[PDB]
Coordinates of C-alpha atoms and ligand atoms in Angstrom, one line a residue:
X25 CA 7.1 -30.2 -11.5
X26 CA 10.1 -29.9 -9.3
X27 CA 10.7 -26.8 -11.6
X28 CA 8.2 -23.9 -9.8
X29 CA 9.2 -20.3 -10.6
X30 CA 11.7 -19.4 -7.6
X31 CA 12.3 -19.3 -4.3
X32 CA 14.7 -16.6 -5.3
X33 CA 14.5 -16.3 -9.2
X34 CA 17.3 -13.7 -10.8
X35 CA 16.3 -10.9 -13.2
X36 CA 19.0 -10.5 -16.3
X37 CA 20.3 -7.5 -14.2
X38 CA 20.9 -9.4 -11.2
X39 CA 22.2 -12.6 -13.5
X40 CA 24.6 -9.9 -14.8
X41 CA 25.8 -8.4 -11.3
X42 CA 25.9 -12.5 -10.2
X43 CA 27.9 -13.7 -12.8
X44 CA 30.3 -10.4 -12.7
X45 CA 30.7 -11.0 -8.7
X46 CA 31.6 -14.8 -9.0
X47 CA 33.2 -14.8 -12.6
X48 CA 34.4 -17.6 -14.9
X49 CA 36.6 -19.2 -11.8
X50 CA 33.2 -18.4 -9.4
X51 CA 31.2 -20.1 -11.5
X52 CA 33.3 -23.3 -11.5
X53 CA 33.6 -23.2 -8.2
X54 CA 29.6 -23.0 -7.7
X55 CA 29.5 -26.3 -9.9
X56 CA 31.8 -27.9 -8.0
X57 CA 29.2 -27.6 -5.0
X58 CA 26.8 -29.1 -6.4
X59 CA 28.6 -32.0 -7.8
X60 CA 29.7 -32.4 -4.5
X61 CA 25.9 -33.1 -3.1
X62 CA 25.3 -36.7 -2.3
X63 CA 22.6 -37.5 -5.1
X64 CA 19.1 -37.8 -3.5
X65 CA 17.8 -41.4 -4.7
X66 CA 19.4 -45.0 -5.3
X67 CA 20.7 -46.9 -8.6
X68 CA 20.1 -50.0 -7.4
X69 CA 17.8 -51.4 -10.6
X70 CA 20.6 -49.8 -12.6
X71 CA 23.7 -51.6 -11.6
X72 CA 21.6 -55.0 -10.9
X73 CA 22.7 -58.2 -13.2
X74 CA 21.1 -58.3 -16.6
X75 CA 20.6 -54.5 -16.9
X76 CA 24.5 -53.9 -16.5
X77 CA 24.9 -54.5 -20.0
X78 CA 22.4 -52.6 -20.9
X79 CA 24.2 -49.1 -19.8
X80 CA 26.9 -47.5 -22.0
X81 CA 28.8 -46.5 -19.0
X82 CA 29.2 -48.5 -15.6
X83 CA 29.6 -44.9 -13.9
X84 CA 26.6 -43.3 -15.4
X85 CA 23.7 -45.3 -13.7
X86 CA 19.9 -43.7 -13.4
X87 CA 18.0 -43.2 -10.3
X88 CA 15.4 -45.9 -9.3
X89 CA 12.8 -43.2 -8.3
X90 CA 12.6 -41.8 -11.9
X91 CA 13.4 -44.5 -14.4
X92 CA 11.2 -45.2 -17.5
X93 CA 10.1 -48.7 -16.7
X94 CA 9.4 -50.8 -20.3
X95 CA 6.0 -52.9 -19.7
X96 CA 7.7 -56.3 -20.6
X97 CA 6.2 -59.7 -20.5
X98 CA 7.4 -63.4 -19.2
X99 CA 10.1 -65.8 -20.2
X100 CA 11.6 -63.6 -23.1
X101 CA 14.9 -63.2 -21.3
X102 CA 14.4 -59.2 -20.8
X103 CA 13.7 -56.8 -18.4
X104 CA 11.7 -53.2 -17.7
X105 CA 15.2 -51.8 -17.6
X106 CA 16.3 -48.8 -20.2
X107 CA 18.6 -46.1 -19.0
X108 CA 16.4 -43.4 -19.1
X109 CA 15.1 -41.1 -16.5
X110 CA 12.0 -39.1 -16.6
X111 CA 12.5 -35.3 -16.2
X112 CA 10.6 -32.3 -15.3
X113 CA 9.8 -29.3 -17.2
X114 CA 9.3 -25.9 -16.5
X115 CA 5.7 -25.9 -14.7
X116 CA 5.4 -29.5 -16.8
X117 CA 5.5 -33.1 -15.3
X118 CA 7.5 -35.5 -17.4
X119 CA 8.4 -33.0 -20.1
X120 CA 11.2 -34.9 -21.5
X121 CA 13.1 -38.6 -20.8
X122 CA 16.5 -38.1 -20.6
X123 CA 18.8 -41.3 -22.0
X124 CA 22.0 -42.7 -23.2
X125 CA 22.5 -42.9 -26.7
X126 CA 21.3 -46.5 -27.4
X127 CA 23.4 -49.5 -27.8
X128 CA 22.7 -52.6 -30.4
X129 CA 21.2 -54.7 -27.5
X130 CA 19.1 -51.6 -26.4
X131 CA 17.6 -50.6 -29.8
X132 CA 14.6 -52.6 -29.3
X133 CA 14.2 -51.3 -25.9
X134 CA 14.8 -47.6 -26.9
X135 CA 12.0 -48.0 -29.1
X136 CA 9.4 -49.7 -27.0
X137 CA 9.9 -47.0 -24.9
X138 CA 9.2 -44.8 -27.6
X139 CA 6.3 -46.4 -28.4
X140 CA 4.7 -47.1 -24.7
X141 CA 5.6 -43.5 -23.4
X142 CA 3.9 -42.4 -26.6
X143 CA 6.7 -39.9 -28.0
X144 CA 6.3 -37.8 -31.0
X145 CA 9.8 -36.0 -31.3
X146 CA 13.3 -37.6 -30.4
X147 CA 16.3 -34.7 -29.8
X148 CA 19.7 -36.7 -30.8
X149 CA 22.4 -34.2 -29.6
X150 CA 26.0 -35.9 -30.7
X151 CA 27.1 -37.8 -33.9
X152 CA 27.8 -41.5 -33.7
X153 CA 31.3 -41.1 -32.8
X154 CA 33.4 -37.9 -32.0
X155 CA 37.4 -37.8 -31.4
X156 CA 37.3 -41.9 -31.3
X157 CA 34.9 -41.8 -29.0
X158 CA 31.6 -43.7 -29.4
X159 CA 28.5 -41.8 -28.6
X160 CA 25.6 -43.4 -30.2
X161 CA 24.4 -46.4 -32.1
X162 CA 22.5 -46.4 -35.2
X163 CA 19.0 -46.9 -33.9
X164 CA 17.3 -45.5 -36.8
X165 CA 17.1 -46.0 -40.9
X166 CA 19.3 -43.4 -42.3
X167 CA 17.6 -42.6 -45.7
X168 CA 14.0 -42.3 -47.1
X169 CA 12.2 -45.5 -47.7
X170 CA 14.7 -47.9 -45.5
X171 CA 13.6 -49.4 -42.5
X172 CA 14.5 -51.9 -39.6
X173 CA 12.4 -54.3 -38.1
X174 CA 12.7 -54.5 -34.1
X175 CA 10.8 -57.2 -33.6
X176 CA 7.0 -56.1 -33.7
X177 CA 8.2 -52.6 -34.4
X178 CA 8.9 -51.5 -37.7
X179 CA 10.7 -48.0 -38.4
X180 CA 10.6 -46.6 -41.9
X181 CA 11.9 -43.1 -43.0
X182 CA 10.0 -40.8 -44.4
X183 CA 12.1 -38.0 -45.1
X184 CA 15.5 -36.3 -44.0
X185 CA 16.2 -32.6 -44.6
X186 CA 19.1 -30.7 -43.7
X187 CA 19.7 -27.4 -42.2
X188 CA 22.5 -25.8 -41.1
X189 CA 22.8 -26.5 -37.8
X190 CA 20.7 -29.4 -37.5
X191 CA 18.8 -32.6 -39.4
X192 CA 15.5 -33.2 -39.6
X193 CA 13.8 -37.0 -40.1
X194 CA 10.4 -38.0 -40.1
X195 CA 9.9 -41.2 -39.0
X196 CA 6.8 -44.1 -39.0
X197 CA 6.6 -46.6 -36.3
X198 CA 4.5 -49.6 -37.3
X199 CA 3.5 -51.6 -34.2
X200 CA 2.7 -55.1 -35.8
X201 CA 1.4 -56.3 -32.7
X202 CA -1.8 -53.3 -32.3
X203 CA -1.9 -53.0 -36.0
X204 CA -1.1 -49.6 -35.2
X205 CA 0.7 -46.4 -36.9
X206 CA 2.7 -43.3 -35.7
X207 CA 4.8 -40.4 -36.9
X208 CA 7.6 -39.1 -35.1
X209 CA 10.3 -36.7 -35.6
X210 CA 13.8 -37.1 -35.1
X211 CA 16.1 -34.2 -35.0
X212 CA 20.0 -34.5 -34.6
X213 CA 21.5 -31.1 -33.8
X214 CA 24.6 -30.7 -35.6
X215 CA 26.6 -27.9 -33.9
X216 CA 28.1 -28.8 -31.1
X217 CA 31.5 -28.9 -30.9
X218 CA 33.7 -32.0 -30.4
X219 CA 35.8 -29.9 -27.7
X220 CA 34.5 -27.7 -25.1
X221 CA 31.0 -26.1 -25.6
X222 CA 29.4 -23.8 -28.2
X223 CA 31.2 -20.4 -28.8
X224 CA 27.9 -19.2 -29.5
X225 CA 24.5 -19.9 -28.1
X226 CA 22.3 -19.1 -30.8
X227 CA 22.3 -21.9 -33.2
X228 CA 21.3 -23.9 -30.1
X229 CA 18.6 -21.6 -28.9
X230 CA 17.5 -21.7 -32.5
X231 CA 17.3 -25.3 -32.4
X232 CA 15.4 -25.3 -29.4
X233 CA 12.9 -23.5 -31.1
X234 CA 12.4 -25.8 -33.8
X235 CA 12.2 -28.6 -31.3
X236 CA 9.2 -26.7 -29.3
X237 CA 7.2 -25.8 -32.1
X238 CA 7.5 -29.5 -33.9
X239 CA 6.5 -30.5 -30.2
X240 CA 3.5 -28.2 -30.0
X241 CA 2.5 -29.5 -33.6
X242 CA 2.9 -33.1 -33.3
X243 CA 0.8 -32.6 -29.6
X244 CA -2.0 -30.6 -31.6
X245 CA -2.2 -33.8 -34.2
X246 CA -1.9 -36.2 -31.8
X247 CA 1.7 -34.3 -23.3
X248 CA 4.1 -37.3 -24.4
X249 CA 7.7 -36.3 -23.1
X250 CA 10.4 -35.3 -25.7
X251 CA 13.6 -37.7 -25.7
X252 CA 16.6 -36.3 -25.7
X253 CA 19.8 -37.9 -26.0
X254 CA 23.7 -37.5 -26.5
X255 CA 26.6 -40.3 -24.9
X256 CA 25.6 -41.0 -21.6
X257 CA 22.3 -38.8 -21.5
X258 CA 23.7 -36.3 -18.7
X259 CA 26.0 -33.5 -20.2
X260 CA 24.5 -32.2 -23.8
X261 CA 21.0 -33.6 -22.5
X262 CA 21.1 -31.9 -19.2
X263 CA 21.9 -28.6 -21.0
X264 CA 19.6 -28.6 -23.6
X265 CA 17.3 -29.3 -21.1
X266 CA 18.3 -26.6 -18.2
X267 CA 18.4 -23.8 -21.0
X268 CA 14.9 -24.8 -22.1
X269 CA 13.2 -24.7 -18.6
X270 CA 15.5 -21.4 -17.6
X271 CA 14.6 -19.9 -21.3
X272 CA 10.6 -20.6 -20.3
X273 CA 10.5 -19.1 -17.4
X274 CA 12.7 -16.1 -18.4
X275 CA 9.7 -15.6 -21.4
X276 CA 7.2 -16.4 -19.2
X277 CA 8.1 -14.0 -15.6
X278 CA 11.4 -12.7 -16.8
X279 CA 13.5 -14.4 -14.0
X280 CA 15.3 -17.6 -13.7
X281 CA 17.5 -19.1 -11.7
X282 CA 20.4 -21.5 -13.5
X283 CA 21.9 -23.1 -9.7
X284 CA 18.0 -23.9 -8.6
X285 CA 17.1 -25.5 -12.1
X286 CA 20.4 -27.7 -12.3
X287 CA 20.1 -28.7 -8.9
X288 CA 16.6 -29.5 -9.0
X289 CA 17.1 -31.4 -12.6
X290 CA 20.3 -33.7 -11.1
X291 CA 17.6 -35.1 -8.2
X292 CA 15.4 -36.7 -11.5
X293 CA 18.4 -37.2 -14.3
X294 CA 21.3 -38.0 -11.6
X295 CA 24.6 -36.4 -13.1
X296 CA 22.8 -34.0 -15.4
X297 CA 25.4 -31.2 -16.4
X298 CA 28.6 -32.8 -16.3
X299 CA 31.4 -30.3 -16.6
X300 CA 32.2 -27.0 -15.7
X301 CA 32.4 -25.8 -19.1
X302 CA 29.1 -26.7 -19.6
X303 CA 27.5 -25.3 -16.2
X304 CA 28.9 -22.4 -17.1
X305 CA 27.8 -22.2 -20.7
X306 CA 24.2 -22.7 -19.3
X307 CA 24.7 -18.8 -17.8
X308 CA 27.3 -17.3 -20.7
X309 CA 24.2 -18.8 -23.1
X310 CA 21.0 -16.8 -21.4
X311 CA 23.3 -13.6 -20.9
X312 CA 23.9 -13.9 -24.6
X313 CA 20.3 -14.2 -25.5
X314 CA 19.5 -11.5 -23.4
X315 CA 21.7 -9.2 -25.3
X316 CA 20.2 -10.7 -28.3
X317 CA 16.7 -9.8 -27.0
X318 CA 18.3 -6.4 -26.3
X319 CA 17.8 -7.1 -22.6
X320 CA 21.0 -5.6 -21.5
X321 CA 22.9 -2.2 -21.2
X322 CA 26.5 -2.0 -20.8
Ligands
75A433 C1 34.8 -42.9 -17.2 C2 33.6 -43.2 -18.0 O1 33.7 -44.2 -18.9 N1 32.8 -42.3 -17.5 C3 32.0 -40.9 -18.3 C4 30.9 -41.2 -18.4 C5 30.4 -40.1 -19.4 C6 29.7 -38.8 -18.9 C7 29.7 -37.6 -20.0 C8 29.4 -37.4 -20.8 C9 29.1 -37.0 -22.1 F1 29.2 -35.4 -21.6 F2 29.6 -36.7 -23.4 P1 27.0 -36.4 -22.5 O2 26.8 -35.1 -22.8 O3 26.6 -37.6 -23.5 O4 26.3 -36.8 -21.0 C10 30.3 -38.7 -21.8 C11 30.6 -39.5 -20.8 C12 32.8 -39.7 -17.1 O5 33.6 -38.7 -17.4 N2 32.5 -39.7 -16.1 C13 32.2 -39.0 -15.0 C14 30.9 -39.6 -13.9 C15 29.8 -39.1 -13.7 C16 29.6 -39.1 -12.2 N3 29.1 -40.7 -12.0 C17 29.7 -41.3 -10.5 O6 30.9 -41.2 -10.7 C18 28.8 -42.0 -10.1 C19 28.3 -43.3 -10.3 C20 27.9 -44.7 -9.6 C21 27.4 -43.9 -8.6 C22 27.9 -42.7 -7.6 I1 27.0 -42.4 -6.0 C23 28.6 -41.7 -8.4 C24 32.8 -38.0 -14.6 N4 34.1 -38.6 -13.6 O7 32.8 -36.8 -14.6

């Protein structure tokens, strides 16, 4: 895993001084320096003929080095391509798969990836459309007992539950070619605002705990990667994963490094963290968490 504790991790105390010394604008500038970096890797496969139509955004290709390859087959007029990247987690290889919001022409590829990678949990961070911007196709059966066939794969809704900040749906994936069935939990975070970032991170951190516990539970009963996606799979997705990583390290060693985490993440899921606001949000969310945990003195 590229996410190892340190070198140079910070304690809550040090993070406080770090943020106060730079302020909001200083953090924005720091983000702009990360954005300046020349990507580590290439995008030849993503920008090639046949796969271009498989990207929701022409300016958001995935790295060749870390892309998730589909074990396709002969003359069916398809490929092994899907805009999705393997992402390490804190001291964990391939803890996540950051990907774009599925397109109609990639629904089957998305589920083929879920099946092939033995995914147990899917995390959706947006709605189908926000502010008039399409951000994700309706790739799963919405209501209980409804089902959708994707060739040899059938997906059935076994039940939905609406929470205050997220909705949970249980799905059954039936592979008719291998005559096997699996249960997958689909989570949709509902509290990310249409504009800017969450005013408070409490909801998102609580949601993170819900996802963590469900993955743990699913794993014990079956580690497979958690599929996390947003429109382009780099903004809210990178924020969710960067927070999970830092919080994980904060729990285990009482230290963290936002800069390091985001920089390392962008070598696996290129362009992770798309705005200076989201970068700043990472720092603020951690400080807000530390205060809620009674770790901060004024
Ligand atoms: C113009 C356009 O449609 N692109 C968007 C793509 C996009 C990114 C992020 C989101 C998001 F925040 F909602 P989500 O949370 O779902 O991720 C949505 C859409 C954009 O703002 N453009 C980006 C571009 C990203 C940087 N890439 C490159 O520019 C690039 C491309 C190819 C090769 C190379 I080297 C670099 C921008 N301008 O901020």
